[PDB]
Amino acid sequence: QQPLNEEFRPEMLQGKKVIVTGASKGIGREMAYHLAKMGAHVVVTARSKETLQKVVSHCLELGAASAHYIAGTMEDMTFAEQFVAQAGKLMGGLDMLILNHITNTSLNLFHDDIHHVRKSMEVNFLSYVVLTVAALPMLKQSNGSIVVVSSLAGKVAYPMVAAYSASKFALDGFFSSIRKEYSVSRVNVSITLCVLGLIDTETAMKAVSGIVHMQAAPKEECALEIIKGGALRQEEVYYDSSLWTTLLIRNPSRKILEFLYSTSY
Amino acid sequence: QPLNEEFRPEMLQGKKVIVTGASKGIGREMAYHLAKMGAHVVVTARSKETLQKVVSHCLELGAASAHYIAGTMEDMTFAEQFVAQAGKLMGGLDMLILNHITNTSLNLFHDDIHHVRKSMEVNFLSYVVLTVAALPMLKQSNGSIVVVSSLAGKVAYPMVAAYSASKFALDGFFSSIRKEYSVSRVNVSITLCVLGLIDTETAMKAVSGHMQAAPKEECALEIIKGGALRQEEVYYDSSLWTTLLIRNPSRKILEFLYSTSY
Amino acid sequence: QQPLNEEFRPEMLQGKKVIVTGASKGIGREMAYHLAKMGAHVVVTARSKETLQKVVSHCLELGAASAHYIAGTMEDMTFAEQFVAQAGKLMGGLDMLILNHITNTSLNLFHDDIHHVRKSMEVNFLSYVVLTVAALPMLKQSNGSIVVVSSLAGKVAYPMVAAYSASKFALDGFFSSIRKEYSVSRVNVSITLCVLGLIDTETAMKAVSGIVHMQAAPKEECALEIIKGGALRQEEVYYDSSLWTTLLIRNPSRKILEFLYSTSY
Amino acid sequence: QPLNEEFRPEMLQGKKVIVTGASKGIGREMAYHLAKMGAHVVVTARSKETLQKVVSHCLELGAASAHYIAGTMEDMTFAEQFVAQAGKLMGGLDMLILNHITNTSLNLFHDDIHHVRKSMEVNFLSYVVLTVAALPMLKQSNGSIVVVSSLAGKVAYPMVAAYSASKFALDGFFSSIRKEYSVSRVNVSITLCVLGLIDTETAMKAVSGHMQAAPKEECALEIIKGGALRQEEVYYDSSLWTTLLIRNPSRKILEFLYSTSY
Numbered sequence A, C: 001q002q003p004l005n006e007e008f009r010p011e012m013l014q015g016k017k018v019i020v021t022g023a024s025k026g027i028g029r030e031m032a033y034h035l036a037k038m039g040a041h042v043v044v045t046a047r048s049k050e051t052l053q054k055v056v057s058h059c060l061e062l063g064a065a066s067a068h069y070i071a072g073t074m075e076d077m078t079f080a081e082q083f084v085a086q087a088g089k090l091m092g093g094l095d096m097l098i099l100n101h102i103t104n105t106s107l108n109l110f111h112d113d114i115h116h117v118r119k120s121m122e123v124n125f126l127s128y129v130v131l132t133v134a135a136l137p138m139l140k141q142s143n144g145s146i147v148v149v150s151s152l153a154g155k156v157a158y159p160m161v162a163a164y165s166a167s168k169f170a171l172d173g174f175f176s177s178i179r180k181e182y183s184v185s186r187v188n189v190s191i192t193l194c195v196l197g198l199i200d201t202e203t204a205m206k207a208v209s210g211i212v213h214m215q216a217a218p219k220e221e222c223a224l225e226i227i228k229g230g231a232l233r234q235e236e237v238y239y240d241s242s243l244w245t246t247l248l249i250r251n252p253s254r255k256i257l258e259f260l261y262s263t264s265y
Numbered sequence B, D: 001q002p003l004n005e006e007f008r009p010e011m012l013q014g015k016k017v018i019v020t021g022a023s024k025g026i027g028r029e030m031a032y033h034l035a036k037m038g039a040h041v042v043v044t045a046r047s048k049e050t051l052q053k054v055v056s057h058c059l060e061l062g063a064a065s066a067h068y069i070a071g072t073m074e075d076m077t078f079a080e081q082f083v084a085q086a087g088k089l090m091g092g093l094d095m096l097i098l099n100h101i102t103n104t105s106l107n108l109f110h111d112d113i114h115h116v117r118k119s120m121e122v123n124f125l126s127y128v129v130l131t132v133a134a135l136p137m138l139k140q141s142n143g144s145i146v147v148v149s150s151l152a153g154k155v156a157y158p159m160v161a162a163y164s165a166s167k168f169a170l171d172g173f174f175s176s177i178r179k180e181y182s183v184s185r186v187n188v189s190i191t192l193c194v195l196g197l198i199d200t201e202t203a204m205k206a207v208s209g210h211m212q213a214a215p216k217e218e219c220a221l222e223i224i225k226g227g228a229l230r231q232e233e234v235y236y237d238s239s240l241w242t243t244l245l246i247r248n249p250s251r252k253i254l255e256f257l258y259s260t261s262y
């Protein structure tokens, strides 16, 4: 797709209608807060109504045009599909879908745990496809945007996150393929894949907590960079504390192999 | 990590190898080459009758031995027991070649979740099930896992979204546990094969309607060598340009940087 | 250095005072014309007064705030040094120095021709150092800019241009080193190295003329991209007809090796 | 283009090698290693008396033979005749190791053109003069040119501008004629060495005032192996990171793309 040629401005999001999944904690809660401050309409979801209600309330205090939540688990494809309909009804439509939630995971060597690999595939990848299918009609109306949160470990290999990484790699293959289909079908819905390094969320800090030696990036600036890449219809957003990463992560060869195919049928 | 030496057909003689997806195409070609080198081979696929004919040409070609066990890799119980059966038959396992795929649609994606799920189950999740079932024996032999993949499991193409998800998922999963095995000192190698267009009957059916196609029998040999030599990646396309562009040295640099965290 | 954060606008060059060397033909003449159209003051040089006079006249018709030329050969270090003084006097100072000239060269296998290697070093590299030394006082006054025209063959290796390529590589080592010195000395003069693929100038078209199979880029758009990179104080400008080139030419590893040194004394 | 094999000291026994800049530092270490391997060696530098002592330790260490010819590489007539003299003395040339540099100032550049010119003459132009003089003999032996260079001849550093110009110029010139020799089928290899900080007395004098330094004697061996094995580049630094970052695979990809124009 083609990015907006112009600097991000907070106003771009005023009055927009935006779903954020996995928004009761961590990066998704910060995205909800940034959206509130921008005067957006927001619907947030996750499994926990109590934690969601606090986000909603804080969003209203922050200046959210409106804010609501709907709770359920993204293990359930029926919930996933219905949540989008309910959300689009609560707001009168949909400009941007931000898919962020993952299944609970911890760092461990992979041994035996196919159930964890399947659940990660289901919750972290397949639910995102089900949300996008539910959302696409409204997004076509609005010429909207899908934002997909992924990870450095959906681009390069690390130990201890085998199932997680499978699922983040799947999101790159899937949404990157359909982005190429949206170009040849003339569908004007952007797809932004967010590639994040370690971010200082509470779940992550608890797991890497003087247990593994690395520097975390701030979760609020992370959340705004995600929303910006989305608003400006960028293909990929990269966010990490290290400049080695930001310089070495892009893959110009892949872009050339894609262009060679793209230009010969 | 790789083998010092150049490939020699004798590396496989007497070796105990499973080949999945071996009724048709590249997997059939691998069964052949392995037989022509004197390996023990257990092959699998859904086509019982066509597997019979495959296992017989293998014996004709020199296999130390050959068996097939038919079933669908839609079924994780079957994937799991197939590996136990295949190991009893050979008294061990030196090499696990994972090659099967479910049938893929060259179509735009619209709303078929069922097909996305099934591609994931057969193209990816079965590979993990089989790997989990084969590891005890492969640890006992310092064996090899070979994982067959695709240009579309390294770069994005329209019309193959579910397939490319499943092929990218493989890279993520197997490249992670490869880091894991390096750190926990598991001496089982993992080779990922990245193939451009190969002239198999499946591919030639789907694309009929040019793209240059590489020889399925050369392809299948390249895969076995890669695995025999314990290489991380094998690339096989008919265009030298394509094989140049497939390498990702930034990724391998970044993975080194990141490992000093651990 | 730090680029201007903002889009190029033609106005940026209105009233600026700009030397262009090698400006009687090819890319440098186009740069002179682009500068004229922008309302800049320009002084152009090269060995040939007649061809220079035509450029000057055309520049005045195009809207040049002023335009003059001074002729001499850049084999002569005394000329080079004095030309800058004369030019800065003609204009009352100096905002931008564009070093562009090269010695006449053709495509040939290297055999025996040390004289050609030395003359290329002298004219294509050493004269640029002598111009920059002469210019630096005025440029410090103006917080000005040095623009250095180089080539893909000052970044990667081709046959048939051995001496030329030596000289273009030397310019990258020299000016890139002094750019790092300007950062630690707090000298606010930018240095832009222009890395060009085949451009459709008459001298080049004559040499590659159905003799070697390649696609040329347009010389006028090339010339404007050079001036823009300069005005916006970019470190490097890349210009080639091929997108393989523009994606693969940058060297993020070199930038990381530079940053690692830069941040430890 | 490279040699199939691993390095063996016997590759140099009986070999006819020039080493420039061999009075002091890395070039002295190379003269030694080459003697300890039984090469014929002609060494050069300006220090007559110190060259004498070098040529004598070479004989003690096992050289098939050893000579020095003293002169300054400021003088192109000398560079030229030195190679003829050195070849008569050995009856040929198998390897030309170009290693000398003029003395470098760690200072900011301000206005010293004379020093920029002289660095270019001694660090670069002399290398080309010597190469032109040595090529007939090297063609006759399928020999090797080895060109010693630096981090600062691949990336930019403040305080060494004239030196880095001369070291980048070498990369440009010699990498071009290397393409040229590939196309015109000249069977002389060209190796470019890219060195980080080495613990030579010169370097240790200049930087005294940390940076980790690599062993000059290991360094000098790495250079000779690279050249013996006919490799394009040799990289030698004490940090593995540094040696990872020095490689430029985009450049080598782009040079392939661009060669199909020709």
Ligand SMILES: NC(=O)c1ccc[n+]([C@@H]2O[C@H](COP(=O)([O-])OP(=O)(O)OC[C@H]3O[C@@H](n4cnc5c(N)ncnc54)[C@H](OP(=O)(O)O)[C@@H]3O)[C@@H](O)[C@H]2O)c1
Pocket: A021, A022, A023, A024, A025, A026, A027, A028, A045, A046, A047, A048, A051, A072, A073, A074, A075, A099, A100, A101, A102, A103, A104, A123, A149, A150, A151, A152, A196, A197, A198, A199, A200, A201, A202, A203, A204
């Ligand atoms: N933090 C990092 O270092 C890092 C690094 C790279 C990428 N990322 C990506 O950033 C995103 C957010 O991570 P984060 O660290 O902010 O995570 P987090 O703080 O742990 O939040 C996870 C969110 O997902 C929800 N969730 C968990 N299981 C769910 C289920 N079955 N159904 C619906 N929601 C469920 C949780 O709420 P409930 O449990 O109440 O349901 C929570 O709201 C993820 O996609 C992650 O991969 C994070």
Ligand SMILES: NC(=O)c1ccc[n+]([C@@H]2O[C@H](COP(=O)([O-])OP(=O)(O)OC[C@H]3O[C@@H](n4cnc5c(N)ncnc54)[C@H](OP(=O)(O)O)[C@@H]3O)[C@@H](O)[C@H]2O)c1
Pocket: B020, B021, B022, B023, B024, B025, B026, B027, B044, B045, B046, B047, B071, B072, B073, B074, B098, B099, B100, B101, B102, B103, B122, B148, B149, B150, B151, B195, B196, B197, B198, B199, B200, B201, B202, B203
């Ligand atoms: N050929 C190409 O252009 C190309 C390009 C990139 C990658 N590759 C990769 O190469 C590998 C082989 O490809 P190919 O062209 O040889 O394909 P193929 O000829 O269609 O063979 C696929 C194999 O998988 C088996 N299979 C299909 N469904 C199965 C199921 N449910 N359970 C168990 N086995 C099943 C098939 O046998 P049954 O139907 O008898 O079960 C067949 O033996 C694949 O991993 C593919 O992605 C090929």
Ligand SMILES: NC(=O)c1ccc[n+]([C@@H]2O[C@H](COP(=O)([O-])OP(=O)(O)OC[C@H]3O[C@@H](n4cnc5c(N)ncnc54)[C@H](OP(=O)(O)O)[C@@H]3O)[C@@H](O)[C@H]2O)c1
Pocket: C021, C022, C023, C024, C025, C026, C027, C028, C045, C046, C047, C048, C051, C072, C073, C074, C075, C099, C100, C101, C102, C103, C104, C123, C149, C150, C151, C152, C196, C197, C198, C199, C200, C201, C202, C203, C204
């Ligand atoms: N064209 C390309 O494909 C290409 C590709 C990559 C990089 N570049 C770079 O772009 C720049 C311009 O190239 P171009 O193709 O536009 O060249 P051009 O058209 O041949 O112009 C060369 C200019 O330099 C002048 N010149 C030659 N020898 C000189 C001397 N001794 N003293 C002063 N001026 C002298 C010529 O005028 P007089 O002879 O009258 O003195 C002429 O004005 C060069 O730095 C070149 O390396 C060009």
Ligand SMILES: NC(=O)c1ccc[n+]([C@@H]2O[C@H](COP(=O)([O-])OP(=O)(O)OC[C@H]3O[C@@H](n4cnc5c(N)ncnc54)[C@H](OP(=O)(O)O)[C@@H]3O)[C@@H](O)[C@H]2O)c1
Pocket: D020, D021, D022, D023, D024, D025, D026, D027, D044, D045, D046, D047, D071, D072, D073, D074, D098, D099, D100, D101, D102, D103, D122, D148, D149, D150, D151, D195, D196, D197, D198, D199, D200, D201, D202, D203
């Ligand atoms: N050591 C490092 O940290 C480092 C780092 C990067 C690259 N390198 C490269 O390694 C090579 C050797 O460096 P080094 O540290 O060994 O330097 P060195 O010890 O200073 O030796 C330079 C050699 O060149 C000779 N030389 C100096 N001026 C000469 C002249 N005018 N004519 C002929 N010979 C002359 C010197 O001998 P005389 O004075 O007797 O003439 C000496 O034998 C150089 O190419 C250098 O750039 C070294």
Ligand SMILES: C[C@](O)(c1ccc(C(=O)N(C2CC2)C2CCN(CC3(C(N)=O)CC3)CC2)cc1)C(F)(F)F
Pocket: A104, A105, A106, A107, A151, A152, A153, A158, A159, A160, A161, A164, A196, A197, A198, A203, A204, A205, A207, A208, A212, A214, B258, B259, B261, B262
């Ligand atoms: C869910 C969870 O918070 C998580 C899971 C995966 C990631 C993740 O995406 N990360 C990459 C850096 C982006 C992780 C990759 C794994 N690192 C730790 C390790 C490392 N070597 O960096 C394996 C030890 C932690 C961050 C971050 C956090 C955790 F609980 F697993 F930590």
Ligand SMILES: C[C@](O)(c1ccc(C(=O)N(C2CC2)C2CCN(CC3(C(N)=O)CC3)CC2)cc1)C(F)(F)F
Pocket: C104, C105, C106, C107, C151, C152, C153, C158, C159, C160, C161, C164, C196, C197, C198, C203, C204, C205, C207, C208, C212, C214, D258, D259, D261, D262
């Ligand atoms: C002075 C001259 O116009 C010239 C000299 C060098 C270049 C130059 O910078 N070029 C690189 C592409 C930017 C050349 C590099 C050499 N190519 C021709 C060759 C090729 N393989 O591309 C060697 C045959 C022509 C363009 C362009 C033009 C010429 F006369 F030599 F052509």
